Amino acid sequence: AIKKAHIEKDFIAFCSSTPDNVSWRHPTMGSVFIGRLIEHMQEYACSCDVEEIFRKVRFSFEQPDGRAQMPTTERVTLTRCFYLFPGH
Amino acid sequence: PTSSGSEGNVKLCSLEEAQRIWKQKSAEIYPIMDKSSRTRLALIICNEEFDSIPRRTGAEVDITGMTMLLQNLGYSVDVKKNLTASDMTTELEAFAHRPEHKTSDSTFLVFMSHGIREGICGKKHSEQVPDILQLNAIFNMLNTKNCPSLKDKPKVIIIQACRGDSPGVVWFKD
Ligand SMILES: CC(C)(C)[C@H](NC(=O)c1ccc(N)c(Cl)c1)C(=O)N1CCC[C@H]1C(=O)N[C@H](C=O)CC(=O)O
């Protein structure tokens, strides 16, 4: 028998800046957002769900530094917490 | 405490803390498939060398870091480089068709390129002839209609790209 499912569900997108605005990349050290996301995933994947980790990344950008940017999560249809349970 | 394992520098979730999390709001956590049999996939699309846009030097550091991180988290990582928007669409449709998603619990997609307000720049982009991939197309290609194998499973999209030319700041008096 056929059943209906939501056509769009269980998505989260995380962008490196807010609309209209630049993101920064260091020519030898890589993109600031990417490096910060990796650090936060490494530190917090064990204890926080992905939405909370993205919030912490956002918080880490909160004070500008001459190269300001604010990561933005977009189009979120996660219905549950996504824990990565690193090691399992 | 060693980074020698498959998880590298990612701090591990102890099975103490795991069942602590898994019992506090179990009805509201995405289920994880058995580690011995699951086939998680991730896709990284990175454009560093462009026909008419300056090269994104440092991009290789981003590729290395995200590839190792996603592997550390349990994903088999496909890395594709210097694609047009059409090439990106073709790669995403192929990724949506991968049989491993059936025996996976989740996926990550990472896009790293120049960007404008409208979306992500393909290899051949110029303001004369734009070569843009919209975020809306990415969602459509991975949704339940076009990627039924990922129905009910978290799909995480990471985008490193400018969204315009503005500095993102305003002055205020201290
Ligand atoms: C790489 C660069 C020399 C061009 C420059 N970076 C620095 O001047 C710098 C100097 C010291 C530092 N500690 C850090 Cl962190 C950075 C930079 O990034 N930009 C210049 C303006 C907009 C923005 C940019 O090009 N955004 C791309 C948008 O599409 C995002 C992408 O390509 O990923």
- Nearest 5 degrees, angle CA B39-CA B41-CA B47? 165
Give dist(CA A81, CA A50) in Å, integer: 7
Domain that holds residue B91: 15-160
B45, two tokens: 């699309």
* Residues B107-118: b if buried by 16+ CB within 10 A, e if exposed: bbbbbbbbbbee
Residue matched to tokens 């990284």: B44
Closest among A55, A29, A50 to B157, alpha carbons compared: A50
Q: How many whole angstroms separate alpha carbon B72 and alpha carbon B82?
A: 25
Testing ligand 1's pocket by substitution, the residue of B44, B162, B165 carrying the most ligand atoms inside 8 A of its CB is B162
Strand, coil or helix: what is A12? strand
CA distance A50 to A44: 9
Q: Does B2 reside within a domain?
A: no
Measured in angstroms, the CA of B23 and the nearest CA of chain A are apart by: 13
Cα distances (angstroms) measured from residue B44 to each of B71, B76, B92: 12, 11, 10
Task: Select from B74, B13, B154 the least CA-distant residue to A43.
Answer: B13
Residue B71 domain-assigned (yes or no): yes
Strand A11-15 relative to strand B155-160, pairing: parallel
Strand order of the β-sheet with B132-133 is: B115-116, B119-121, B132-133
For ligand 1, say whether the CB of B114 is within 6 Å of any of its atoms: yes
- Which H, E and C letters describe chain B, residue by residue? CCCCCCCCCCCCCCHHHHHHHHHHCHHHECCCCCCCCCCCEEEEEECCCCCCCCCCCCHHHHHHHHHHHHHHCCCEEEEEECCCHHHHHHHHHHHHCCHHHHHCCCEEEEEECCEECCEEECCCCCCCCCCEECHHHHHHHHCCCCCHHHCCCCEEEEEECCCCCECCCCCCCC
Other CB atoms within 10 A of residue B34 CB: 9
B126 CA → ligand 1 middle, Å: 18
Chain B residue with minimal CA distance to A48?
Answer: B21
Question: B109 near B159, Cβ under 8 Å?
Answer: no
Cβ atoms A27, A19 nearer than 8 A:
no
**Separation CA B165–CA A21 (nearest Å):** 6
What DSSP designation does A21 have? B
Question: Domain for residue B7, yes or no?
Answer: no
Phi/psi of residue B43, nearest 5 degrees? -130, 130
Listed residue (A88, A78, A50, A40) closest to B17, CA to CA: A88
Q: B169 in a domain, yes or no?
A: no
- Collect all residues of chain B within an 8 Å Cβ-Cβ radius of residue A10: 30, 150, 152-155
Domain containing residue B110: CATH number: 3.40.50.1460
Confirm whether B104 is domain-assigned. yes
Residue B162 to residue A15, Cβ atoms within 8 A: no
Count of residues in chain A: 88
* Distance from the alpha carbon of residue A23 to the mean position of ligand 1, in angstroms: 7
Distance of alpha carbon B144 from alpha carbon B41, whole angstroms: 17
Structure's resolution in angstroms: 1.9
Q: At what angle do helices B59-72 and A32-44 cross, to 10 degrees?
A: 20
Cα(B125)–Cα(B54) distance, rounded to whole angstroms? Answer: 11
Residues from chain A that touch B167, judged by Cβ atoms under 8 A, are 21-22, 68
Q: How many angstroms from the chain centroid is the CA of residue A16?
A: 8
Q: How many domains does chain B have?
A: 1
Q: Is residue B156 part of a domain?
A: yes
Measured between alpha carbons, how far is B40 from B102 in angstroms, rounded to an integer?
9
Distance CA B169, CA B130 (A): 27
Yes or no, beta carbons of B169 and A7 under 8 Å apart: no
